[PDB]
User: Fold Phosphoenolpyruvate carboxykinase, cytosolic [GTP] from Rattus norvegicus.
Amino acid sequence: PQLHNGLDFSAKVIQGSLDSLPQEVRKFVEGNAQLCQPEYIHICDGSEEEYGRLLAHMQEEGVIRKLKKYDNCWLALTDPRDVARIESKTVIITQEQRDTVPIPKSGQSQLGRWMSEEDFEKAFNARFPGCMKGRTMYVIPFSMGPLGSPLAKIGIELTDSPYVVASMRIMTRMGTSVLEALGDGEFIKCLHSVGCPLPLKKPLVNNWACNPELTLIAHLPDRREIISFGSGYGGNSLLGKKCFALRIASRLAKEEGWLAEHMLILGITNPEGKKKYLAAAFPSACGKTNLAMMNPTLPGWKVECVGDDIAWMKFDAQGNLRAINPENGFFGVAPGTSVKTNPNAIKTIQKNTIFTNVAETSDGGVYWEGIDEPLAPGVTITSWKNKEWRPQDEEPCAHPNSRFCTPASQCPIIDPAWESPEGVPIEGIIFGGRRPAGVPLVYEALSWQHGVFVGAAMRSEATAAAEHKGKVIMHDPFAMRPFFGYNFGKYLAHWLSMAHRPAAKLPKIFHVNWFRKDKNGKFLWPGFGENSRVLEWMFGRIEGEDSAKLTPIGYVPKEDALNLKGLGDVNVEELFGISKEFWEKEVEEIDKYLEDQVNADLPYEIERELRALKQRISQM
Ligand SMILES: Nc1nc2c(ncn2[C@@H]2O[C@H](COP(=O)(O)OP(=O)(O)OP(=O)(O)O)[C@@H](O)[C@H]2O)c(=O)[nH]1
Ligand SMILES: O=C(O)C(=O)CS(=O)(=O)O
Ligand SMILES: [Mn+2]
Ligand SMILES: [Mn+2]
Ligand SMILES: [Mn+2]
Assistant:
């Protein structure tokens, strides 16, 4: 009801009808419309016609440019201050800090950023009132996971950015059919604004609306709400991806008995006609998408991609660990992608793809560092900074975190079960990161508990996907450090508890290192498609082949167990060397980290594995 005409926003709806929305969805839209004061409300239907009009609008506004060389591909250039996920402005709100992070012994927590409800209310009120003035509020109904899948969850994202709408159409399942499936069910509430109400007080760089000073990405798991302000970019604005499908979801998974993880899912078929699925957790910028889409060098082997970034997993009644990819597309790092490093991505991205912050060629194409493809005479390059660019300039032509956004169904090796609602059965889990020294090419964990310790102990040299820079070795347990939705100690206990489940078929756990360097700073391992030789060894180990040798850190391939035919120049002694001096220091760093950062919430089984590793190294 109303005493005037200030609460009913029906007169501002330019697509759809508030009356057709489920009651709780309507309240969420209208209540936030009252707060944010949009000029128009657009309820997305997911149709091709809608997508075409939004592209045309963004093109008319100068937000995107058409890449005339390809089929329906587009380029967006951002403000250089809004180029990546920002870990330091990402917070989780719970009544008690211990629900979100373990209370550290001495230092500041690196495992999350907690904010009190009272502090968030002040931050919220300083940002959102009136923030969409003069803009359209888009209502995005989306499903994470195939519609109707038992592990599928529905969200509603409100946003004032058409770029977010177009990207969410690719990255999620979006539109009218989701609203019909939702009915009066529960949904995750996602609220986003670029934070630039009109009239603009500050001019825009590259026609990219953002508010870097006020950027804040908040999660309220108890209210099932995600609230993001000030950034239009990737993990900050596509709220289904990191905010929902890892942070909120990992908390729900803890409550409901499943897992939500930063893992690719791949299926690999051997020359005997046997197929197995594996999941792999590597940190951002550490090669998940390259592995998920790999073109194997070994003849008679095939790799198919289920997903490249997020996995939701649950034991079924039979004890199989089943996984789904909740995403609908790939949001992949562009630089370094070439016919030699990821040819299956090259095939995927040549139609229906949105590129952000890569270079444009004068004939309507895309360019980036590492594309490894020469240009014809006379073709010139415009950098992501909208400037003429020559290879003689110092700066790269594409931002290091520039991305492609592409439909998963276009991938030529997309797995036939990638949308199956029952998920695929996982028989191995791979961990790994960038370790230039000390850590061998591959090893296998000694037990479930040791494998959980291996995940907990993950470290990786700093890349350029967050705001971290330089060559520092940082901790990134389970590749989830930016993404834990709750107390990491309780997350470890959750993982350990899977061994207590009746008839659970626990997968084998492996750790890889593609990145070991020699004294010259040269990679010892060619990687990319050649990583199929490591997968072959894992496949045989899952089948029970006697192809491993025991070391203090776990099982490693026997001499001649790895197919190295075609790379006779491979230094196997350096690739698999285990130095007592390196590992004595490694265990001390892991010990100091777990003691400070996990403290009273460290499960005893993890401390026991640490003690056992220390003892095995001491006996070397
Ligand atoms: N040496 C070596 N480098 C690799 C290999 N696979 C991938 N890379 C490197 O990994 C980098 C690209 O990784 P990203 O696409 O950023 O990694 P990602 O895990 O998919 O990142 P997110 O999408 O942010 O989660 C490039 O620097 C590649 O050179 C490999 O097998 N060997
Ligand atoms: O940082 C990551 O792991 C990504 O996959 C990119 S974003 O979705 O977080 O922007
Ligand atoms: Mn205009
Ligand atoms: Mn990726
Ligand atoms: Mn990722």
